[PDB]
Design a protein around this ligand. Structure first.
Ligand code: HEM
Ligand code: HEM
Lengths: 146, 149
């Protein structure tokens, strides 16, 4: 539509910008279930194989509690990592930022598997922060929340 | 402090993702002159020989005085077209969107010359809009202007 289409554009744009194989952005509602879930790097066939949508339970729920960008050379190092459900493709390098405006958080933007086992840089972080802010404006524009 | 590197990254990713040969991002000051001019797709002979920075005099200011994106098959069939100074590459397809945040317009981001003479698409314009809004965030964060502080 308009939000979905802009969210998809951001995820695609961020992955390209930071040169990541995969990207997602989830936006969650009042019940903490997703309203918007947009992902890059995986076709519809593997998507259906993965099955359930994420619960945002580990590193990603660290991202929503904190407001902090999370930038990791290996996500399994992080205390709150829970690992991946079967068929989900393996990923180690992780760059995730919150999607936000004012003191409101809507969800997150996250990228994995930077080309060759290269770590994400701070350059990369600032770009993903710029795009996650563009995503905050887009959600706030669409309204969606009280 | 990364502002310039950020904009150069944005312009580069824009041009490539939309298949344009050329792309540029200009931010102007309170005095209507460029503060930042980022461009992609040209050598140094050429850049030196274009000479003078653009004044934002035609289609580029159409984007200035009213937001909304401009997407054209042929630059010269916009009633604002001024043309190009000598040495500047000829450009026919155009895709332009204002760079901005809140009620502030800091500049414009633009692409020309989709490969194969193809025209810019809606999807092309959506992506660029996304990158331009991120560029406005980046200009805003940089506290370059008083309506940021
Ligand atoms: C294509 C880009 C994707 C990226 C960048 C991505 C990222 C991640 C990351 C970093 C984790 C780590 C969990 C942790 O250790 O805390 C994870 C787990 C998980 N992912 Fe993905 N993912 C993608 C695609 C998908 C898709 C398409 C689905 C499902 C339809 C999905 C569903 C899940 C589920 C159910 C988990 C278990 C954790 C949870 O519920 O939060 N992912 N993903
Ligand atoms: C490489 C990416 C570039 C793009 C996409 C681009 C785009 C354009 C476009 C579309 C116009 C026509 C405006 C109109 O006719 O209404 C134009 C004109 C012009 N360009 Fe470029 N340009 C690029 C590079 C440059 C560079 C590097 C310079 C100077 C160093 C320059 C200087 C000018 C000048 C002086 C004009 C005449 C209009 C004005 O003064 O605003 N251009 N350009």
């Amino acid at each position: 539509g308009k939000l979905d289409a802009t969210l998809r554009a951001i995820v695609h744009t961020a992955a390209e910008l930071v040169d990541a194989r995969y990207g997602a952005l989830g936006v969650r509602g009042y019940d903490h279930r997703l309203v918007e879930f947009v992902y890059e790097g995986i076709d519809e066939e593997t998507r259906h194989l993965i099955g359930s949508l994420p619960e945002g339970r580990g590193v990603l729920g660290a991202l929503i509690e904190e407001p902090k960008p999370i930038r990791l050379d290996d996500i399994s190092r992080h205390p709150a990592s829970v690992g991946f459900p079967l068929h989900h493709p393996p990923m180690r390098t992780f760059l995730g930022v919150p999607v936000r405006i004012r003191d409101e958080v809507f969800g997150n933007l996250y990228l994995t598997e930077k080309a060759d086992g290269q770590p994400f840089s701070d350059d990369d972080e600032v770009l993903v922060q710029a795009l996650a802010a563009a995503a905050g404006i887009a959600v706030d524009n669409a309204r969606l929340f009280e």
